[PDB]
Design a protein around this ligand. Structure first.
Ligand SMILES: [Zn+2]
Ligand SMILES: [Zn+2]
Length: 420
């Protein structure tokens, strides 16, 4: 609990500066002794203090060091043996440990430096009942530089403008590494309950808030209604498509099996293709200020990321799936309605879960599921062919690597994925 405000790892050889900020010795030497010679929290000069004590081996607060060592030895010894990414990874764990009320945030797909966040309109405030989405961008120098935070949902606030920019001291001048994204999100919640009209970002809204509060409250609720009516993230657990890879392998090679080690690689392929297409689809949606990812954003992602004929075929399979899905009967399952083996409803959840956008249309998961199915069928067809070469009836990792390397286009697509 008595943690280092920089790295969020248990204080080892804590160093307490004259300003009485404390940071573990590793953080101190890297950020104060090696270059800055200033406190990373309040920026007070500690040059004279650092040189006087480094010569006498008296940087560590012995009293503080002995207490945490006896009380919490396991974490001191675990730690004993980049910084931005790890700090961001520790933030996500902190968010899961003490989830901030009315708030949630998580990375966009597998990109840790780009998060999505939701803020429920605080209770008894004119934004109550609305869900407000925000975009968070962690800089290279995190936590030494602030995170870029902005609203993507329009809101009526004296300190929030049409760009989604948030005028809030801790986001810039008063930012400190000791702050966490959870603390930042809770400060935004307070700002919604108690605007700061005397330091406005939108003077008109501040003047109305200062001279006609009834008006301000009315317009805030109308805006909350018109525009405001985002989770842990993708998580660390690896999804699997074994059920559906098996189904496709049966269609393509009914007399050929696939080993357990090979199936894990197939999952890796499918998960990698999902992440890349959805990630690009997320970029396009944000680029064009669209709240919903649809079949259009998925297609353009496939057109750009897939090579040559794979892209053309995948685009065809995705277009035919959506077309068949729109004309199908409403009663059957979504996968059945699109004529696919891969799970449409499940792909939609994973698209929603990955924080790729505020909303996800019904055509997107159909188009993406059909693309995943097609690419899976191509890999399995070639992998099965590769196995038949070696006089084998069961696909193994070696046959998967062969099929990818022997196909120019698939090698371009999956060559970077590691096969053991
Ligand atoms: Zn530290
Ligand atoms: Zn300080």
């Amino acid at each position: 609990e008595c943690q280092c405000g920089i790295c969020m790892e248990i204080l080892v050889e804590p160093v307490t500066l004259p300003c009485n900020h404390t940071l573990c010795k590793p953080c101190f030497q890297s950020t104060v002794e090696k270059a800055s010679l200033c406190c990373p929290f309040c920026r007070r000069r500690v040059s004279s203090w650092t040189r006087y004590h480094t010569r006498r081996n008296s940087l560590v607060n012995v009293e503080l060091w002995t207490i945490i060592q006896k009380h919490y030895p396991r974490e001191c010894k675990l730690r004993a043996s980049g910084s931005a990414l790890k700090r961001i990874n520790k933030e996500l764990s902190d968010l899961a440990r003490d989830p901030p009320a009315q708030c949630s945030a998580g990375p966009v797909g597998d990109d840790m430096f780009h998060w999505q966040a939701t803020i429920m309109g605080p209770n008894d405030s004119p934004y109550q009942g609305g869900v407000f989405f925000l975009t968070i961008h962690f800089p290279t120098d995190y936590p030494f530089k602030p995170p870029k935070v902005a609203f993507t949902t329009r809101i009526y606030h004296p300190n929030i403008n049409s760009n989604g920019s948030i005028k809030l001291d801790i986001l810039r001048s008063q930012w400190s590494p000791a702050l966490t994204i959870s603390k930042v999100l809770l400060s935004i919640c307070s700002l919604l309950c108690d605007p700061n009209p005397d330091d406005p970002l939108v003077p008109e809204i501040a003047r109305i808030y200062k001279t006609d509060r009834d008006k301000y409250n009315r317009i805030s609720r109308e805006w909350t209604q018109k525009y405001a009516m985002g989770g842990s993230g993708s998580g660390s657990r690896k999804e699997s498509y074994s059920i559906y890879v098996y189904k496709v392998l049966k269609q393509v090679h009914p007399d050929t099996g696939i080993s357990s080690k090979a199936m894990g690689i197939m999952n890796s392929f499918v998960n990698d293709i999902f992440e890349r297409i959805a990630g690009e689809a997320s970029r396009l949606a944000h680029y064009n200020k669209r709240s919903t990812i649809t079949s259009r954003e998925i297609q353009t992602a496939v057109r750009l990321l897939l090579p040559g004929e794979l892209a053309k075929h995948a685009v065809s399979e995705g277009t035919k799936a959506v077309t068949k899905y729109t004309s199908s009967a409403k009663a059957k399952t979504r996968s059945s309605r699109a004529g696919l083996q891969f799970p449409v409803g499940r792909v939609h959840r994973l698209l929603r879960k990955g924080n790729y956008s505020e909303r996800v249309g019904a055509g997107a998961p159909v188009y993406l599921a059909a693309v995943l199915e097609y690419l899976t069928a191509e890999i399995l067809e070639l992998a099965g062919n590769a196995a038949r070469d070696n006089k084998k009836t069961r696909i193994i990792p070696r046959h998967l690597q062969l099929a990818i390397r022997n196909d120019e286009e698939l090698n371009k697509l999956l060559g970077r994925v590691t096969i053991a």
